Symmetry: C2
Subunit: 322 residues, 2 copies
């Protein structure tokens, strides 16, 4: 009844949520963004498997050989002291600490910390980052620290997935794009947020129209060539139009480019449209393994169109009840 | 205390070992070779993770979402009837049978069955095989059915790893190479078997010499460009010479080309030579996850040079005792 630890399976955990008192955004959403970026980079570009558990409150038995912890700590030298972001990588087999970082976040060093994190993991894991990974990040990242904070706040609304969160994501990203129009990826994230909003409330129109200009623009920017996010947009657009084969093709390319909780949800969605519930539930369960918790659960149940977990994903319905 | 099934983790199981009575080789080693080929192809060329448990007698709790079973079955129409190789892929989450094949092996259809298996898995898993995978297989496979049977018998001796097994592997592969000199990969497998033998008994010489001609030849055959097996040979050769950096470099390229139990053992071996036991034990435990059982255990403890599992791999020593 021993469970064998798998040294190439990694959990990512978060603790001390809210240095002091309620949230408290800013630092939390930055850390959530970073952890999602580590997870997706590793799932996509290495033979490591990562469960991003940042949004998961539950301690369950895992065969994960390694655990990456993110914790906001204070030394305790005074009242309302400044936090540091403690990040540790532990080997659960041999007990050792593989990496132990203490980051002070400053309003300019957000990109630098994240880069340091990814270099450090590369070394601790003997995992070189591939050219495609390095070229994808130069395409998706802003250059100024504070734009990354802002981006990750909008991104965290996206993760949440509810109407109000998405409306907030959209408006934040419109701001970001206004202050830095070169930041193409922000436009792409805004376009994804906007198609998703519309997908769920398909009888609405702003000055019309609108969303179509945005989406028409975005799929033509040569800069966004060969990014998953453009395939996510194409998938959603084709599903809304009931062009299921085109949606299928699009999301499968997206998955080739990025192994993410969201791509597997979108694939589940397309499978339901194909009348293939068992393939759908399998995709949703893959999504849940990648990022377990209320955000992903929320997206399975609500994203694009509504989905009954009890009827369509019985394995997950039963798992969550147990 | 629920364990979440991971739909991209696959166990491969074997049953009915020995259609009838003792072994019984031929069909068994063919099936072992096929299962090792499925495992390594999937680990290497997809985001699936496979535990090849064909050589593992133990039932332990696994979060594997899917299980591939290989079983030798008889209908029971007469005495000493002919076996069929039953191969099923089951989804442990939703209970369903994803693939159910009944193969009759004939002395000519060995390549054809294996190909059919790999096409079928590709479809059942929605997993297209990449160009590098398809080009690697055309390079490593013979064309005549019976050569594959012979190859996999020698390969199975390799898996076993003991002196007598390797001597048998070597002689079988010398035969194979004599009857089909175009079958370059057989020469490579023979060269790998031969360096490994020599590594373990470094004070022996045949007509001298010998092994060096074989190894000198093999690393020059342009046909074997960009195959893991050449990097395995270079790794072993450099370790024997105490050229640790060169061995390190070689095995890490090998691992880029093929994610296999053996590459991770070889890497563990190089780590010990680097004075890095914790990195070694981590590599060995990766090897054990890839192919758990006595063969891999045997290679950890004996391959190239001797290694104490109790002192060098305490996590595994303790796991196996529990």
């Amino acid at each position: 009844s021993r469970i064998l630890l798998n040294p190439r399976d990694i959990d990512i955990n978060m603790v001390n949520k809210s240095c002091n008192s309620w949230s408290s955004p800013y630092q939390l959403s930055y850390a959530i963004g970073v952890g999602d970026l580590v997870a997706t980079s590793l799932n996509t570009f290495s033979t490591f498997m990562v469960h991003d558990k940042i949004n998961y409150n539950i301690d369950e038995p895992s065969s994960s050989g390694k655990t990456l912890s993110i914790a906001f700590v204070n030394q305790r030298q005074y009242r309302a002291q400044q936090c540091f972001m403690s990040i540790k990588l532990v080997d659960n087999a041999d007990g050792s600490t593989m990496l132990d970082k203490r980051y002070v976040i400053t309003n300019g060093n957000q990109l630098a910390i994240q880069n340091d994190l990814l270099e450090s993991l590369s070394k601790a894991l003997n995992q070189p980052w591939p050219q495609r990974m390095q070229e994808t990040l130069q395409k998706i990242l802003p250059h100024r620290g504070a734009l990354l904070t802002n981006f990750y706040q909008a991104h965290d609304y996206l993760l949440h997935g509810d109407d109000k969160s998405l409306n907030r994501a959209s408006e934040l990203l419109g701001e970001i794009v206004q202050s830095s129009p070169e930041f193409t990826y922000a436009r792409a994230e805004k376009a994804l947020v906007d198609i998703v909003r519309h997908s769920q409330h398909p009888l609405d129109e702003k000055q019309l129209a609108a969303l179509n200009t945005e989406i028409d623009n975005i799929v033509t920017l040569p800069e966004l060539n060969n990014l998953s996010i453009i395939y996510q947009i194409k998938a959603v657009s084709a599903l809304v139009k009931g062009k299921t084969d085109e949606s299928y093709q699009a999301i499968n390319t997206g998955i080739d480019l990025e192994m993410s909780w969201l791509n597997y949800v979108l694939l589940g969605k397309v499978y339901e449209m194909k009348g293939m519930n068992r393939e759908a539930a399998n995709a949703y369960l893959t999504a849940f393994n990648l990022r377990p918790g209320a955000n992903t659960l929320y997206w399975i149940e609500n994203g694009i169109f509504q989905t009954s977990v009890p009827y369509v994903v019985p394995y997950l319905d039963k798992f969550l009840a147990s």
